[PDB]
């Protein structure tokens, strides 16, 4: 039930809504365009409707404040918000290749190169939130857009938190996510360690081509993560398995910090691409020297 | 996209749809009727479309299988069930008043007599499932069920579990009950307790007028949990105040049996009526003498 065309009133803005992408959860997102100066951009429209409740205003406000504070090459641009009162709108720039779920759904496991492509891109992201400490809590392979030029955007702020001052432990979080961490579940409290446990998470998907931790049910897979009971098949490169295995650790003081992620025999060591071929939505690159 | 009309190919009976009522989860419920004996049930019709992955459908049938071995006062008639294949039938002994979550949200606290009423006959129904070594898991307001003489009736199999060797736990379980059991939580297994625990919650709403562990936040209500954090109020009176003591206790082994409860001074040495006044779904019965 939602308005062809979108006001903002501080802003006088005015925009048409084009076609329909997806879902946050309680939303729906569409592109659409500046009608002025036609500039096209992703809207996430959500239904006041579902926002009855205090707490799930609060926590769509949260989204929207740790989100417009972020500028940066892989984190998906806010762009403003406004709201009638059957609908908030958030405007956010457009990524013209979906996110890195599509990706995997054409292509399963990925070459090593376009591994560390991918992965460098997601961790600078990471670093950027986490000096801004915000931690994500929900990276994964939807969350994770792509650009026309294939570079990553991390979105959906949909989870995230702020760490409000230092040695603070979240303890509790509000949602399901798909790639989650051990403490998160074993409520002892959590921190920013939990987006590099997800990065691990991953890159085993990325490398392997299914996710560490399947099943037919969520439950045991959440008992095979507290157990950490995962295992890596023998094709994956040692380099690889073992940066996997450092970041796919129960303890969370045992993972790697991000910063000090790109440093890692893995991506040091090894070729990473300074772009891709857009033939690699579909086609594996086989990255001949002439 | 529902029949209008429903035809059991194995035993031939036919039935008319009649008005909507609620959910299941994935089910919706209608009343139906015999249409050659025009006698009146249930139906929690189950669309297909939403189990197409093996592990809903073994829930599916899990519960049938649960659900049809029992036969019981104070359970759901179960009448049968058949599938066409966009959807499957079940066919339920028709509650002709509802259940105690419409009870409660029109009268919030009950007088202690009604609560024993009830109580006993959650408890019956309780101790005829442990017998046949059934566990409810979800035992809430909403789940029982109000015959037209009032009397309880447990439904919903959608979550319970057969033990079927002693001294067995288990580690699972998939789904999000509302009066859930702390060991559930801090995932070190399972059994018979946590019903115990659910009518303790059961019985301190019923009492009180609102939830044990209520909060804005679901995972915060969690928390609460596993810490034991909740109080009595002081106007209630301390042998039930006791009793509900008893069952909301962390370690399942504390908590009394389901045969035991029955003993407890709560309804030994307490009025239990014999019937409840029609008038009692929105008047407080005063229960006097002549
Ligand atoms: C799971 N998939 C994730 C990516 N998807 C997808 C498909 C088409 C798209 O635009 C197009 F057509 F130009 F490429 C885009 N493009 C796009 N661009 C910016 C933001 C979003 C977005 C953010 C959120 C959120 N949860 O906050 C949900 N979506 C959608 N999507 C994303 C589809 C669903
Ligand atoms: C949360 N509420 C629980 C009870 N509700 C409710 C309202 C009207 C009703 O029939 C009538 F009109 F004759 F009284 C009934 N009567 C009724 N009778 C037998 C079974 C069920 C039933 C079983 C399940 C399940 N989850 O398996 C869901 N429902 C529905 N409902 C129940 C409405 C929703
Ligand atoms: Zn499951
Ligand atoms: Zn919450």
Redesign the pocket.
Same mark, same amino acid.
């Given at each position: 039930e939602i308005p062809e065309v979108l006001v903002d009133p501080r802003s006088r803005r005015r925009y048409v809504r084009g076609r329909f992408?997806? @879902?946050?959860g309680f939303?729906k997102?569409f &592109?659409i365009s500046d009608a002025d100066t036609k500039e096209v951009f992703?809207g @996430?429209i959500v239904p006041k409707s579902l926002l009855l409740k205090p707490h799930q205003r609060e926590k769509m406000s949260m989204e929207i404040s740790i989100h417009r504070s972020l500028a940066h090459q892989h984190v998906?641009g806010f762009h403003g918000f406004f709201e009638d009162n059957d609908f908030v709108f958030v405007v956010? &720039?457009?990524? !013209? !290749? !979906?996110?890195l779920? &599509?990706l995997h759904k054409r292509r399963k496991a990925l070459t090593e190169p376009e591994a560390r492509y991918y992965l460098r891109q997601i961790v600078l992201g990471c670093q950027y939130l986490h000096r801004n400490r915000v931690i994500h809590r929900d990276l994964k392979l939807?969350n994770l857009?792509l650009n026309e030029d294939l570079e990553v955007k991390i979105?959906?702020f949909?989870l995230a938190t702020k760490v409000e001052y230092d040695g603070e432990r979240k303890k509790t979080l509000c949602g399901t996510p798909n790639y989650i961490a051990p403490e998160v579940l074993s409520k002892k409290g959590h921190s920013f360690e939990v987006d590099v446990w997800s990065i691990g998470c991953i890159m085993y998907t990325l490398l392997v081509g299914k996710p560490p931790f399947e099943t037919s049910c969520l439950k045991e897979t959440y008992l095979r993560i507290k157990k950490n009971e995962y295992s890596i098949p023998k094709h994956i490169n040692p380099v690889a398995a073992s940066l996997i295995q450092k970041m796919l650790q129960t303890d969370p003081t045992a993972r790697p910090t991000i910063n000090e992620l790109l440093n890692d025999e893995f991506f040091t060591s090894g070729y990473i691409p300074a772009r891709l071929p857009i033939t690699c939505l579909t086609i594996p690159p086989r990255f001949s020297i002439a």
């Open positions: 992408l997806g @879902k946050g939303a997102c &592109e992703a @996430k998906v956010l &720039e457009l990524c !013209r !290749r !979906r996110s779920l &599509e939807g857009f979105g959906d949909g």
